[PDB]
RNA sequence: CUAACACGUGCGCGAGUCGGGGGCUCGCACGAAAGCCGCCGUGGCGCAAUGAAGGUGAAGGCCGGCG
RNA sequence: UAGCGGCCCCCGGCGCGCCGGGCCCGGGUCUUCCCGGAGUCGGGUUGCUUGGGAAUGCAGCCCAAAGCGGGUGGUAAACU
RNA sequence: UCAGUAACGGCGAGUGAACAGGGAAGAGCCCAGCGCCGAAUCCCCGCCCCGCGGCGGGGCGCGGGAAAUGUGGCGUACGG
């Protein structure tokens, strides 16, 4: 099918064809506003892969996030304390810009549920992501057995609780010797389990 | 019980068994193991030599299970099997020797320390020592290796 | 400050440990609740085994325990296929199945096949419809004697094989086991360097000949 | 003489027969399929090459092989990936030269 | 008051010892107690030390057979 | 209060039957085809974090893939 | 339980996991892609019949729309 060709194309981002396209789009997206609803996915294949389906109730929002790192919000310097905490303007945020974009989209559209997101373009000062949202109260998804999980109350604000694919990457979740910090639910859970006294009844 | 403790006998003595000249202050010498090299050096050197410094190689992902190797000695070697086994071997006349498997009982290496009673034995193990081997050979018997 | 003589100690109470303390005053209540849930499920599944599905024979994966035998997670597909059990039907008729486990050897595979065949011979299967039985089913008379069994089904045992007392021959009395171990260690350690030395000696001989 | 199984040595380990079996289908991933090769070569033909790839191709054409390897390693990463990329670029150059000659 | 350690004392068993976790006991006034498990001793401490490590790993004394 | 004590009302769960609707479904052998997630992995650097120590994990920036490939095999590197 | 251990630390003060083992519980699955089926798919308005206090089922509409920039059935690494 055509998707496989498309995918192998998009993997060739340094080719002149894709480079020209990316340039033109990025110009268009920068000309547009910071957050707006796109009529249809720019990457139909990627939306397919992440879980989008071309049916009523699936909406797509294109959003831009300012690039760079995170400088410490302190008055001038004045991060009062020991010198180890004197850093201001070389620190890095713990979550990725993709996660930031998803959380912004979810906050703006509080009546929808965030499914996934993908990268569509970038420049020196901006990064552009298209994020899939689902209207949980549309019959077209409430009557479909295999997608009605998202309509459950448990799945509110997955991007805010770090449950999407992009958000999960920052939590250090994994299996094996590389991810001992999060044995259990997460870092919080592992730290709790390791830092309590099990004062038994008999001792 | 609080009945039998020194505090009950100490009521009425202002001082509470801690002196008048030098009181019971909070932390006169520093908390924990402070001053190990400066003002507790004499005690540390007199009672815990070798405390400070480094020695040996670092082994990062140590797994004790690889090095697991319990040992048994020849004086205990006959206790692995029942007494009836040993007495039957003793009064047997065909020359047959009982087989003792230390791996079955949970030992991997046989070390030869004790005296061995004079009767043939077929000791099968995973590792042997030279002296244990020569003890078994001298008493008459066989050494069998298993994996 | 150190006293006269004693051990250097490192108590790990330099954090706010008193806020995170797990008292166990609910231990008997927890045991009672777990019991009640256990009996409730046992009553819920009326004739089925209380413990659950049968499980397989496995060897512990370590030098420390490889002599022992556990109860595994589930039977693997090779064993099911060679025992003639469908992977989907095994779960619904009471056989634990996992697809992750491989089978490097044949003794373990044959042992688990024997276990599955014994389980098939032993289980009593109720009619899919209580009125009319089917071909792959158990007859009516032995249904009256179907009861729950406690504990794991066909429990795992570590059985040790005796061989009788043997007579010594001179063949095994000349075996230098300690020497054999030492030369085995030496050969294992020096195998590669000996191969490299042989290789360079061979190429030097070839060069000299040419 | 006597050959007892041992915990140490070249043939260390408890003896047991090892049964052959068909490899798991999961191990098949990455194997190149004819249709996938067709698709990838079509996409390469329509797209072209990356600027670093064509610079490395120029280096190979002028036959500075060590320079090409070093540049590709710097541009891409690991030495294994560098070697594979250099081999594929040399194959592409050979194919182009053969086509030009014939 | 809790935890750790040291030593002294009392009791049980003893080259062993210890169910603390779990389970079985018609759950339930006391009883959230008590009893039992033994193919639930996994495991801890002890029974072997030494070396940085590869590793090694704990008596011998007399007569006949070629001082 | 004790009691497998009594009476009345309401709700549920489990079985049985009836009507209507959907469903036409499986296993073995042989032959032929097909099979995968990209500004992602990975590399450099910077900052934080971790018992993780020539960099455990996370993130910013720059570079940026492959298909007998890729990841892991707790000391950096090449070959196997 | 491993274990205050491997390890980190002006290697000072201090910090510090994991595998295996025994238990409590125990349950497995689904897409995209690759392909085959006349889009075989879904939402909504009108009328008729059922009960409707968790707005559903059946039929009739040359009723409207979504959707080929891809809905549904088969199918997912345990191969199909
Ligand atoms: Mg942080
Ligand atoms: Mg990553
Ligand atoms: Mg006085
Ligand atoms: Mg004083
Ligand atoms: Mg004074
Ligand atoms: Mg004091
Ligand atoms: Mg004092
Ligand atoms: Mg003292
Ligand atoms: Mg730190
Ligand atoms: Mg190494
Ligand atoms: Mg200990
Ligand atoms: Mg110092
Ligand atoms: Mg810390
Ligand atoms: Mg474990
Ligand atoms: Mg259990
Ligand atoms: Mg499809």
Among the listed residues D78, D83, D80, the one whose alpha carbon sits nearest the alpha carbon of residue D65: D83
Q: How far apart are CA C53 and CA B124, in angstroms?
A: 39
Alpha carbon of C29: minimum distance to chain B alpha carbons (Å): 29
- Buried residues in C164-200 as b, exposed as e (16+ CB within 10 A): ebeebeeebeebebbebbeebeeeeeeeeeeeeeeee
Q: How far apart are CA C102 and CA D25, in angstroms?
A: 12
- What residues have a C-beta under 5 A from ligand 1, the ion? A 94
Q: How was this structure determined?
A: cryo-EM
Q: How far apart are CA D35 and CA A4, in angstroms?
A: 10
Pair of tokens at residue B117: 């009673």
In sequence order, the 6+-apart residues with CB closer than 8 A to the CB of B108 are B68, B69, B70, B71, B102, B125, B126, B127
A9–D contact, CB cutoff 8 A? yes
Give me the CA A143–C1' G62 separation in Å, rounded.
30
Torsion of CA A190, A192, A197, A200, to 10 degrees: -80
Q: How far apart are CA B45 and CA B66, in angstroms?
A: 36
Q: What is the 3-state secondary structure (H, E, C) of chain B?
A: CHHHCHHHHCCCCCCCCCCCCCCCCCCCCCCCCCCCCCCCHHHHHHHCCCCCCCCCCCCCCCCHHHHCCCEEEHHHHCCCCCHHHHHHHHHCCCCEECEEEHHHHCCCEEECCCCCCCCCEEEEECEECHHHHHHHHHHCEEEEECC
- Among chain C, residues having any CB pair with chain B shorter than 8 Å are 1-2, 4-6, 8, 10, 62-65, 67, 160, 163-168, 172-173, 175-178, 180-181
- Is the distance from CB of C49 to CB of C149 less than 8 angstroms? yes
Size of interface B-C (CB pairs under 8 A): 72
Sign of the alpha-carbon dihedral angle for C32, C38, C44, C49: negative
Could you tell me how many helices (H) and strands (E) chain D has, helices first? 4, 0
Q: How far apart are CA C196 and CA A30, in angstroms?
A: 64
Sign of the alpha-carbon dihedral angle for A162, A165, A170, A172: positive
Among the listed residues C171, C177, C61, C182, the one whose alpha carbon sits nearest the alpha carbon of residue B126: C177
Q: How many CB atoms lie within 10 A of CB D76?
A: 16
Query: Do residue C168 and residue B140 have CB atoms under 8 angstroms apart?
Result: yes
CA of C186 to the centre of ligand 6 (A): 59
Q: Are strands B99-101 and C69-71 parallel, antiparallel or unpaired?
A: unpaired
Alpha carbon of D75: minimum distance to chain A alpha carbons (Å): 13
- Is the distance from CB of A59 to CB of A65 less than 8 angstroms? no
Angle at A198 between CA A195 and CA A203, to 5 degrees: 145
- What is the largest distance, in Å, between two alpha-carbon atoms of chain D? 70
D14–C contact, CB cutoff 8 A? yes
- For chain D, how far is it from start to end, CA to CA, in angstroms? 68
- Is the distance from CB of C181 to CB of B128 less than 8 angstroms? yes
- Residue C149 has phi, psi (to 5 degrees) of -115, 140
Q: How far apart are CA A113 and CA A148, in angstroms?
A: 12
C24–D contact, CB cutoff 8 A? no
Q: How far apart are CA A73 and CA A79, in angstroms?
A: 9
Angle at C39 between CA C34 and CA C44, to 5 degrees: 125
Unique residue bearing structure tokens 């009788």: C164
- Residue D60 has phi, psi (to 5 degrees) of -65, -35
Alpha carbon of C30: minimum distance to chain A alpha carbons (Å): 13
**Helix (H, G, I), strand (E, B), or coil: what is residue A129?**
strand
Q: After which residues is chain B broken (C to N over 2.5 A)?
A: none
Among A201, A202, A203, pick the best mutation site for testing chain C contact (most C Cβ within 10 A).
A201
Q: What is the secondary structure of chain C as a DSSP string?
A: ---SS--------SS-TTTSEEE-TTHHHHHHHHHHHHHHHHHHSSSS-SS-SB--EEE-SSTTTTTSEEE-S-B-HHHHHHTT--HHHHHHHTB-B-SS----BSHHHHHHHHHHHHHHHH-----SSSSS--SSS--SGGGGG-----SSSS---------PPEEP-HHHHT--HHHHHHHHHHHHHHHHHHHHHHHHHHHHHHHHH-
Among D45, D47, D54, pick the best mutation site for testing chain A contact (most A Cβ within 10 A).
D47
Pair of tokens at residue D61: 């054409």
Pair of tokens at residue B1: 């019980």
Radius of gyration of chain B (CA): 30
In sequence order, the 6+-apart residues with CB closer than 8 A to the CB of D67 are D59
A63 conformational bin, left if phi > 0, alpha if psi -120 to 50, beta if neither: beta
CB D22 within 7 Å, strand F: no
Please state, in angstroms and as integers, the Cα–Cα distance from residue C191 to each residue in A43, C178, C181, D14, following that order. Answer: 57, 20, 15, 21
Q: How many CB atoms lie within 10 A of CB D34?
A: 7
Pair of tokens at residue C86: 């469908």
Q: How far apart are CA A2 and CA A22, in angstroms?
A: 20
Q: How many CB atoms lie within 10 A of CB C75?
A: 27
Q: Which residues pair with C21 in a beta bridge?
A: A197
Strands, E, within D1-101: which ranges? none
A105 secondary structure, DSSP code: H
Residue A165 CA to chain centroid, in angstroms?
7
Chain C residue numbers with beta carbons less than 8 Å from the beta carbon of A192 are: 20
Please state, in angstroms and as integers, the Cα–Cα distance from residue A82 to each residue in A71, A72, A86, A87, following that order. Answer: 18, 15, 7, 11
Q: How far apart are CA B40 and CA A61, in angstroms?
A: 68
Pair of tokens at residue A42: 């720019």
- For chain B, how far is it from start to end, CA to CA, in angstroms? 57
Residue nearest to nucleotide G72 (CA to C1'): A144
Pair of tokens at residue C70: 């556990």
**Helix (H, G, I), strand (E, B), or coil: what is residue A127?**
strand
Q: How far apart are CA D97 and CA D89, in angstroms?
A: 12
CA of B25 to the centre of ligand 7 (A): 12
- Is the distance from CB of B64 to CB of B72 less than 8 angstroms? no
Give me the CA A81–C1' G43 separation in Å, rounded.
61
Please name the helix (run of DSSP H) or strand (run of DSSP E) that holds residue A114, with its range, or none: strand A113-122
Q: How far apart are CA B11 and CA B2, in angstroms?
A: 13
Q: How far apart are CA B101 and CA A201, in angstroms?
A: 42
- Is the distance from CB of A129 to CB of A42 less than 8 angstroms? no
- For chain A, how far is it from start to end, CA to CA, in angstroms? 67
Burial of B135 (0-12, 13-18, 19+ CB in 10 A): buried
Q: How far apart are CA B109 and CA B94, in angstroms?
A: 30
Subunits with at least 3 CB pairs below 8 A relative to chain D?
A, B, C
CA of A191 to the centre of ligand 1 (A): 15
Chain A residue numbers with beta carbons less than 8 Å from the beta carbon of C17 are: 195-197
- Residue C71 has phi, psi (to 5 degrees) of -105, 125
A77 secondary structure, DSSP code: S
- Is the distance from CB of C132 to CB of B84 less than 8 angstroms? no
Please name the helix (run of DSSP H) or strand (run of DSSP E) that holds residue A58, with its range, or none: strand A58-66
Give me the CA A110–C1' G41 separation in Å, rounded.
29
Q: Which residues pair with B121 in a beta bridge?
A: B141
- Count of residues for chain B? 147
Please name the helix (run of DSSP H) or strand (run of DSSP E) that holds residue D73, with its range, or none: helix D65-76
Q: How many CB atoms lie within 10 A of CB C109?
A: 20
CB B77 within 7 Å, strand E: no
Q: How far apart are CA C186 and CA C198, in angstroms?
A: 17
Pair of tokens at residue C137: 């089913």
Q: How far apart are CA A35 and CA A52, in angstroms?
A: 20
Give me the CA A143–C1' G53 separation in Å, rounded.
22
Q: How far apart are CA A158 and CA A145, in angstroms?
A: 20
Q: Which residues pair with A135 in a beta bridge?
A: none
Contacts by C123-128, CB closer than 8 A, 24 or more apart: C123/C93, C123/C94, C124/C47, C125/C93, C126/C47
Residue of chain C with shortest Cα separation from D7: C181
Give me the CA C176–C1' G34 separation in Å, rounded.
63
Q: How far apart are CA C198 and CA C162, in angstroms?
A: 47
Residue of chain D with shortest Cα separation from C175: D2
Give me the CA A125–C1' F62 separation in Å, rounded.
15
Query: Do residue D47 and residue A17 have CB atoms under 8 angstroms apart?
Result: yes
Q: How far apart are CA D68 and CA D74, in angstroms?
A: 10
Query: Do residue D9 and residue C184 have CB atoms under 8 angstroms apart?
Result: yes
- Residue D55 has phi, psi (to 5 degrees) of -65, -45
Q: How many CB atoms lie within 10 A of CB B122?
A: 21
- For chain C, how far is it from start to end, CA to CA, in angstroms? 80
Alpha carbon of B94: minimum distance to chain C alpha carbons (Å): 8
Torsion of CA A104, A106, A109, A113, to 10 degrees: 160
Alpha carbon of D94: minimum distance to chain A alpha carbons (Å): 22
């Amino acid at each position: 099918g055509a998707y496989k060709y498309i995918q192998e194309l998009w993997r060739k981002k340094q080719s002149d064809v894709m480079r020209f396209l990316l340039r033109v789009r990025c110009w268009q997206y920068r000309q547009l506003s910071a957050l707006h609803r796109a009529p249809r996915p720019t990457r139909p294949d990627k939306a397919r892969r992440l879980g989008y389906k071309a049916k009523q109730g699936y909406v797509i929002y294109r959003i831009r996030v300012r690039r760079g790192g995170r400088k410490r919000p302190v008055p001038k310097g004045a991060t009062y304390g020991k010198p180890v905490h004197h850093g201001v303007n070389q620190l890095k945020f713990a979550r990725s810009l993709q996660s930031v974009a998803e959380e912004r989209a979810g906050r703006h559209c509080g009546a929808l549920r965030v499914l996934n997101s993908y990268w569509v373009g970038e420049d020196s000062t901006y990064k552009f992501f298209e994020v899939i949202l689902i209207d949980p109260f549309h019959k077209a998804i409430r009557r479909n057995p295999d997608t009605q999980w998202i309509t459950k109350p448990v799945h509110k604000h997955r991007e805010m609780r770090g449950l999407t694919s992009a958000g999960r990457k920052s939590r250090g979740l994994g299996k094996g010797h590389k991810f001992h910090h999060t044995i259990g639910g997460s870092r919080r859970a592992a730290w709790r389990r390791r830092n309590t006294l099990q004062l038994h009844r008999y001792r | 019980p609080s009945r039998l403790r020194k505090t009950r006998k100490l009521r009425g003595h202002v001082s509470h068994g801690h002196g008048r000249i030098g009181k019971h202050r909070k932390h006169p010498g520093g908390r924990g193991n402070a001053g190990g090299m400066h003002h507790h050096r004499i005690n540390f050197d007199k009672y815990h030599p070798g405390y400070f410094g480094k020695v040996g190689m670092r082994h990062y992902h140590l797994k004790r299970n690889q090095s697991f190797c319990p040992t048994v000695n020849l004086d205990k070697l006959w206790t692995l099997v029942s007494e009836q086994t040993r007495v039957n071997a003793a009064k047997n006349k065909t020359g047959a020797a009982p087989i003792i498997d230390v791996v079955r009982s949970g030992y991997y290496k046989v070390l030869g320390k004790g005296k061995l009673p004079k009767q043939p034995v077929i000791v099968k193990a995973k590792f042997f020592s030279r002296r244990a081997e020569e003890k078994i050979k001298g008493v008459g018997g066989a050494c069998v290796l298993v994996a | 400050a150190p006293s006269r003589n004693g051990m250097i100690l490192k108590p790990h109470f330099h954090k706010d440990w008193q806020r995170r303390v797990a008292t166990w005053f609910n231990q008997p209540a927890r045991k009672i609740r777990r019991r009640k849930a256990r009996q409730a499920r046992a009553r819920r599944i009326a004739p089925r085994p209380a413990a659950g599905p049968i499980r397989p024979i496995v060897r512990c994966p370590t030098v420390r325990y490889h002599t022992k035998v556990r109860a595994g997670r589930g039977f693997s597909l090779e064993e099911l296929r060679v025992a003639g059990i469908h992977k989907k039907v095994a779960r619904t008729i009471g056989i634990s199945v996992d697809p992750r486990r491989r089978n490097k050897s044949t003794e373990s595979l044959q042992a688990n096949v024997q276990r599955l065949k014994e389980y098939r011979s032993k289980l009593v299967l109720f009619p899919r419809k209580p009125s009319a039985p089917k071909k792959g089913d158990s007859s009516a008379e032995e249904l009256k004697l179907a009861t729950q069994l406690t504990g794991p089904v066909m429990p795992i045992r570590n059985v040790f094989k005796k061989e009788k007392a043997r007579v010594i021959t001179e063949e095994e009395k000349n075996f230098k086991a300690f020497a054999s171990l030492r030369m085995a260690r030496a050969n294992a350690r020096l195998f590669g360097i000996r191969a490299k030395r042989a290789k360079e000696a061979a190429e030097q001989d070839v060069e000299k000949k040419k | 003489a006597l050959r007892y199984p041992m915990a140490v040595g070249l043939n260390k380990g408890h003896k047991v027969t090892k049964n052959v079996s068909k490899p798991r289908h999961s191990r098949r991933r990455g194997r190149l399929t004819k249709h996938t090769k067709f698709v990838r070569d079509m996409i390469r033909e329509v797209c072209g090459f990356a600027p670093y790839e064509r610079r490395a191709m120029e280096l190979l054409k002028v036959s500075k092989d060590k320079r090409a390897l070093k540049f590709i390693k710097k541009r891409v990463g690991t030495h294994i990936r560098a070697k594979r990329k250099r081999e594929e670029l040399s194959s592409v150059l050979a194919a182009m030269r053969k086509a030009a000659a014939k």
